[PDB]
Design a protein around this ligand. Structure first.
Ligand code: HEM
Ligand SMILES: [K+]
Length: 294
């Protein structure tokens, strides 16, 4: 079937102020529900939700992507690759109830942007206009990446999302957040100790820790450090491949560069597949609760 064009359509009469309110509600709930996942907070899972709801995109036919907000449908909601994201969706339920006018795609992506910024990460410009599409537009499972592969797999996988080497290495840096949960993915352990703080620790740990390829309780291999951290085979491939290695070293030695590159790559990820009218509003850059004195 001929590829569909998804034109961003601003929620009727809404502007920057309306979305800053949604951002604020999400940020305030992030601060309030601090006990989740042994006090890590919902920050990490919201970022992963934003990425998985966007990562189903296929540049070849524009199927999948953040536009339709199809994660709300069971086929995608139950994707084995999305195990654990239900926690992020449940967190957003009261937010959507208070602001019923925002589309699901805008909420899922804004959730990721809000989480990154509130966790002291870079500012990430965000554009509104995603429109909910029917259940039959939900992409089949299997479009998200496996974690037991090598650099070649990673490089090829991300080409479907139109991401180059630099974009891939920067995006993977999001693993500086949260952790793996055996029950969800068959992997257990965090990548960093300050896992609700967005920084370049993921790269520093990958480069400086002494890693051992071990098997976890799910019989899957993962690199472990005596410090109590892990690196998935796909994460570790970033230092096995010489092209990826150079970029990993770059980010480990330049916090600002990582922030700038991650911001661009993350916005791109969240906007893939969307056509923005020439007269659409400019991207929004939301103030953090801290910047607002809230
Ligand atoms: C080769 C690519 C990638 C693979 C194979 C991968 C794999 C995984 C796995 C296995 C988990 C653990 C899930 C769980 O058990 O709860 C995870 C968590 C996470 N991933 Fe990735 N990931 C990849 C890329 C990315 C990217 C590009 C982002 C976003 C920019 C990202 C953000 C996250 C976050 C924030 C978490 C933590 C979730 C939490 O703590 O609840 N991942 N990923
Ligand atoms: K961190």
């Amino acid at each position: 079937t001929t590829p569909l064009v998804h034109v961003a359509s601003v929620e009727k009469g809404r502007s920057y102020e309306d979305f800053q309110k949604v951002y604020n509600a999400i940020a305030l709930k992030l601060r309030e529900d601090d006990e989740y996942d042994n006090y890590i907070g919902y920050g990490p899972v919201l970022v992963r939700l934003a990425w998985h709801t966007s990562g189903t995109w296929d540049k070849h036919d524009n199927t999948g992507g953040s536009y339709g907000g199809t994660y709300r449908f069971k086929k995608e909601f139950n994707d084995p690759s999305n195990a654990g994201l239900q926690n992020g969706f449940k967190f957003l339920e009261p937010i959507h109830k208070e602001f019923p006018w925002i589309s699901s795609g805008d909420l899922f992506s804004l959730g990721g942007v809000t989480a990154v910024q509130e966790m002291q990460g870079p500012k990430i410009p965000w554009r509104c206009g995603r429109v909910d599409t029917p259940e039959d537009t939900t992409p089949d499972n299997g479009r998200l990446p496996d974690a037991d592969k090598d650099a070649d797999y990673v490089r090829t996988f991300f080409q479907r999302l139109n991401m180059n080497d630099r974009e891939v290495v920067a995006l993977m840096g999001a693993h500086t957040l949260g952790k793996t949960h055996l029950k969800n993915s068959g992997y257990e352990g965090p990548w960093t100790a300050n896992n609700n703080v967005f920084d370049n620790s993921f790269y520093l740990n990958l480069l400086n820790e002494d890693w051992k390829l071990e098997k976890n309780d799910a019989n899957n291999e993962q690199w472990d450090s005596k410090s109590g951290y892990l690196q998935l085979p796909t994460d570790y491939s970033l230092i096995q491949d010489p092209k990826y290695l150079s970029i990993v070293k770059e980010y480990a030695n330049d916090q600002d560069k990582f922030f700038k590159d991650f911001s661009k790559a993350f916005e791109k990820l969240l906007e893939n597949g969307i056509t923005f009218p020439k007269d659409a509003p400019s991207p929004f850059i939301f103030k953090t609760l801290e910047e607002q004195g809230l």
